[PDB]
Motif scaffolding. Sequence first.
Motif, PDB file in Angstrom:
ATOM      1  N   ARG A 140       9.865   3.845   4.503  1.00 53.27           N
ATOM      2  CA  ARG A 140       9.230   2.755   5.198  1.00 53.27           C
ATOM      3  C   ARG A 140       8.678   1.986   3.945  1.00 53.27           C
ATOM      4  N   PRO A 141       8.684   0.475   4.271  1.00 52.83           N
ATOM      5  CA  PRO A 141       8.057  -0.447   3.350  1.00 52.83           C
ATOM      6  C   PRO A 141       6.601  -0.487   3.420  1.00 52.83           C
ATOM      7  N   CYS A 142       5.888  -0.539   2.309  1.00 49.70           N
ATOM      8  CA  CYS A 142       4.314  -0.300   2.377  1.00 49.70           C
ATOM      9  C   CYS A 142       3.933  -1.490   1.018  1.00 49.70           C
ATOM     10  N   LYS A 143       2.600  -1.889   1.413  1.00 52.10           N
ATOM     11  CA  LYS A 143       1.881  -2.221   0.196  1.00 52.10           C
ATOM     12  C   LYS A 143       0.990  -1.389  -0.493  1.00 52.10           C
ATOM     13  N   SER A 144       1.111  -1.512  -1.857  1.00 54.24           N
ATOM     14  CA  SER A 144       0.746  -0.389  -2.364  1.00 54.24           C
ATOM     15  C   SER A 144      -0.416  -0.870  -3.621  1.00 54.24           C
ATOM     16  N   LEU A 145      -1.072   0.049  -3.887  1.00 55.17           N
ATOM     17  CA  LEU A 145      -2.105  -0.205  -5.065  1.00 55.17           C
ATOM     18  C   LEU A 145      -2.322   0.758  -5.772  1.00 55.17           C
ATOM     19  N   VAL A 146      -2.245   0.517  -7.004  1.00 50.59           N
ATOM     20  CA  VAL A 146      -2.625   1.709  -8.220  1.00 50.59           C
ATOM     21  C   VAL A 146      -4.160   1.476  -8.873  1.00 50.59           C
ATOM     22  N   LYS A 147      -4.667   2.342  -9.133  1.00 51.21           N
ATOM     23  CA  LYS A 147      -6.002   2.421  -9.927  1.00 51.21           C
ATOM     24  C   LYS A 147      -5.979   3.645 -10.864  1.00 51.21           C
ATOM     25  N   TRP A 148      -6.453   3.327 -11.995  1.00 53.89           N
ATOM     26  CA  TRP A 148      -6.968   4.720 -12.942  1.00 53.89           C
ATOM     27  C   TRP A 148      -8.123   5.538 -12.206  1.00 53.89           C
ATOM     28  N   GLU A 149      -7.741   6.977 -12.237  1.00 51.50           N
ATOM     29  CA  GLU A 149      -8.538   7.831 -11.547  1.00 51.50           C
ATOM     30  C   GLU A 149      -9.412   8.186 -12.869  1.00 51.50           C
ATOM     31  N   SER A 150      -8.620   8.180 -13.938  1.00 51.65           N
ATOM     32  CA  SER A 150      -8.960   8.772 -15.365  1.00 51.65           C
ATOM     33  C   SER A 150      -8.011   8.075 -16.208  1.00 51.65           C
ATOM     34  N   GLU A 151      -8.377   8.378 -17.676  1.00 55.48           N
ATOM     35  CA  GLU A 151      -7.798   7.641 -18.598  1.00 55.48           C
ATOM     36  C   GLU A 151      -6.180   8.011 -18.494  1.00 55.48           C
ATOM     37  N   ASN A 152      -6.045   9.177 -18.133  1.00 58.35           N
ATOM     38  CA  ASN A 152      -4.369   9.593 -18.094  1.00 58.35           C
ATOM     39  C   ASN A 152      -3.935   9.912 -16.908  1.00 58.35           C
ATOM     40  N   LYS A 153      -4.371   9.354 -15.819  1.00 56.99           N
ATOM     41  CA  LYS A 153      -4.044   9.591 -14.322  1.00 56.99           C
ATOM     42  C   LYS A 153      -4.263   8.448 -13.562  1.00 56.99           C
ATOM     43  N   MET A 154      -3.011   7.961 -12.908  1.00 54.00           N
ATOM     44  CA  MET A 154      -3.179   6.846 -11.937  1.00 54.00           C
ATOM     45  C   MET A 154      -3.029   7.321 -10.449  1.00 54.00           C
ATOM     46  N   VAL A 155      -3.462   6.554  -9.601  1.00 57.19           N
ATOM     47  CA  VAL A 155      -3.383   6.984  -8.114  1.00 57.19           C
ATOM     48  C   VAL A 155      -2.945   5.949  -7.331  1.00 57.19           C
ATOM     49  N   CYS A 156      -2.203   5.884  -6.543  1.00 55.15           N
ATOM     50  CA  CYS A 156      -1.667   5.073  -5.610  1.00 55.15           C
ATOM     51  C   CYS A 156      -1.727   4.909  -4.256  1.00 55.15           C
ATOM     52  N   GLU A 157      -2.563   4.180  -3.504  1.00 51.55           N
ATOM     53  CA  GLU A 157      -2.804   4.427  -2.063  1.00 51.55           C
ATOM     54  C   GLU A 157      -1.754   3.303  -1.383  1.00 51.55           C
ATOM     55  N   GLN A 158      -1.103   3.658  -0.332  1.00 47.03           N
ATOM     56  CA  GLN A 158       0.302   3.106   0.445  1.00 47.03           C
ATOM     57  C   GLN A 158      -0.478   2.552   1.755  1.00 47.03           C
ATOM     58  N   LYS A 159      -0.203   1.465   2.226  1.00 47.52           N
ATOM     59  CA  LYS A 159      -0.363   0.778   3.442  1.00 47.52           C
ATOM     60  C   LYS A 159       0.729   0.241   4.078  1.00 47.52           C
ATOM     61  N   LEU A 160       1.485   0.731   5.224  1.00 44.40           N
ATOM     62  CA  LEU A 160       2.657   0.164   5.804  1.00 44.40           C
ATOM     63  C   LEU A 160       2.698  -1.181   5.884  1.00 44.40           C
ATOM     64  N   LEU A 161       3.631  -1.705   5.696  1.00 40.70           N
ATOM     65  CA  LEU A 161       3.914  -3.154   6.337  1.00 40.70           C
ATOM     66  C   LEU A 161       3.895  -3.440   7.766  1.00 40.70           C
ATOM     67  N   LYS A 162       4.439  -2.603   8.358  1.00 42.42           N
ATOM     68  CA  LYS A 162       4.673  -2.482   9.797  1.00 42.42           C
ATOM     69  C   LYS A 162       4.286  -1.355  10.374  1.00 42.42           C
ATOM     70  N   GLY A 163       3.435  -1.288  11.509  1.00 40.08           N
ATOM     71  CA  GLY A 163       3.493  -0.029  12.311  1.00 40.08           C
ATOM     72  C   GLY A 163       2.423   0.941  11.710  1.00 40.08           C
ATOM     73  N   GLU A 164       2.298   1.939  12.211  1.00 41.77           N
ATOM     74  CA  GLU A 164       1.386   3.037  11.791  1.00 41.77           C
ATOM     75  C   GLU A 164       2.126   4.530  11.282  1.00 41.77           C
ATOM     76  N   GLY A 165       1.496   5.265  10.602  1.00 39.85           N
ATOM     77  CA  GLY A 165       1.994   6.348  10.231  1.00 39.85           C
ATOM     78  C   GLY A 165       1.092   7.414   9.520  1.00 39.85           C
ATOM     79  N   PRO A 166       1.491   8.364   8.849  1.00 39.94           N
ATOM     80  CA  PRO A 166       0.677   9.263   8.176  1.00 39.94           C
ATOM     81  C   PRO A 166       0.178   8.604   6.962  1.00 39.94           C
ATOM     82  N   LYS A 167      -0.978   9.227   6.361  1.00 41.32           N
ATOM     83  CA  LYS A 167      -1.614   8.737   5.276  1.00 41.32           C
ATOM     84  C   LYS A 167      -0.835   9.119   4.049  1.00 41.32           C
ATOM     85  N   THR A 168      -0.014   8.189   3.167  1.00 38.35           N
ATOM     86  CA  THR A 168       0.594   8.298   2.142  1.00 38.35           C
ATOM     87  C   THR A 168       0.066   7.933   0.742  1.00 38.35           C
TER      88      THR A 168
END
Length: 137
Positions: free
Chosen positions: A79-107
């Motif tokens: 499913r198409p989504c808008k994503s955003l990555v942040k550094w949680e720590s020096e060695n680790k990135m985390v990506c939050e996803q938001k669907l472009l259309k509709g609703e769904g589980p938190k991925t």
Amino acid sequence: PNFSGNWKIIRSENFEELLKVLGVNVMLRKIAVAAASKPAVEIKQEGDTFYIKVSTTVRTTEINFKVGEEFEEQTVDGRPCKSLVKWESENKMVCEQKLLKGEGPKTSWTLELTNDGELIETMTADDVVCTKVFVRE
């Protein structure tokens, strides 16, 4: 950390179940699991800017992002989504996803580089987590 390289999978845990609790049908789960059993993963990192290509037997996915800047991709189930990555720590990135259309589980997904050069990926949907581990070729 430098995530750049060509990465090959060495461990996979809970992937089919992640697809299942998302509602992916069994025929497609079976195809997707088998197709992704030995993926090609290419990462090119230049500071906070990343190119990541993932290829299975039947599919290629390419993403381009800079940490802190929204971009478009697809969720694990396509499913198409808008994503955003942040550094949680020096060695680790985390990506939050938001669907472009509709609703769904938190991925979401994460990538972490370990001291011996292993790459850990996690993918989550609500309370179900899949982990994969890769090494450089």
